Design a protein around this ligand. Structure first.
Ligand SMILES: CC(C)(COP(=O)(O)OP(=O)(O)OC[C@H]1O[C@@H](n2cnc3c(N)ncnc32)[C@H](O)[C@@H]1OP(=O)(O)O)[C@@H](O)C(=O)NCCC(=O)NCCS
Ligand SMILES: [Ca+2]
Length: 184
């Protein structure tokens, strides 16, 4: 029984088996997956869910499944994931998000992220949370900066889990520390 979190509209909860079909549909959508190397099939979507569930088991937090009580059982994920890869800003905790496209444009990722960052800073009492994306993914880094996260362009980096010559290799880094979060 992991910690569920609430916003005014959203419930951030543990993943359920019944989420897997809806999540696979999202991960097969080229508009959802545009700024990733490819769309995913069901097996790959399920492997991602399994990784998330292992993270929750090990850490007590993770990328929560998003439910919209009064509206929809599952609309995607938003939450925290430990950064352990060989990058300059590791080790730390990242925040990220993936919403079904019918739910974009509503401030729902913003609300989910605010809820997750409140947990990060108030409950976990983390010193900092980061987020990273590619330059063309304006919807994603726009959300980062709207949350109050900030970027130093000198901290751009090549993603180490991508090939050294991969077209999407260059990522940008945003950070928010506990003090900056408290000042809002
Ligand atoms: C990144 C992603 C989660 C952003 O979702 P989003 O809906 O655009 O983000 P927000 O929740 O902040 O909503 C902001 C939009 O809602 C609108 N909005 C409406 N009501 C709002 C409210 N109450 N609060 C905030 N914004 C509101 C804003 O005007 C903005 O619209 P705009 O883009 O047309 O200007 C989504 O595009 C996505 O899932 N992308 C695919 C997966 C992905 O690339 N993930 C990131 C990998 S790094
Ligand atoms: Ca263990």
């Amino acid at each position: 029984a992991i910690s569920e979190l609430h916003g005014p509209r959203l419930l951030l909860r543990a993943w359920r088996d019944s989420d897997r079909e809806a999540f696979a549909e999202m991960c097969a959508d080229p508009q959802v997956m545009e700024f990733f190397p490819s769309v995913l099939d069901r097996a790959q979507s399920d492997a991602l869910v399994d990784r998330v569930q292992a993270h929750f088991a090990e850490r007590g937090y993770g990328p929560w499944a998003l439910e919209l009580p009064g509206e929809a059982a599952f609309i995607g994920f938003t939450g925290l994931f430990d950064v352990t890869m060989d990058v300059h800003f590791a080790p730390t905790v990242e925040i990220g998000w993936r919403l079904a496209p019918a739910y974009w444009g509503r401030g729902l990722a913003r609300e989910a992220a605010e809820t997750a960052l409140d947990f990060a800073f108030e409950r976990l009492r983390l010193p900092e949370v980061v987020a990273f994306t590619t330059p063309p993914n304006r919807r994603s880094w726009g959300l980062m900066e709207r949350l109050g996260m900030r970027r130093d362009p000198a901290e751009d980096f090549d993603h180490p889990l991508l090939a050294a010559d991969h077209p999407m290799r260059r990522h940008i880094l945003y950070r928010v520390d506990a003090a900056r979060w408290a000042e809002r």
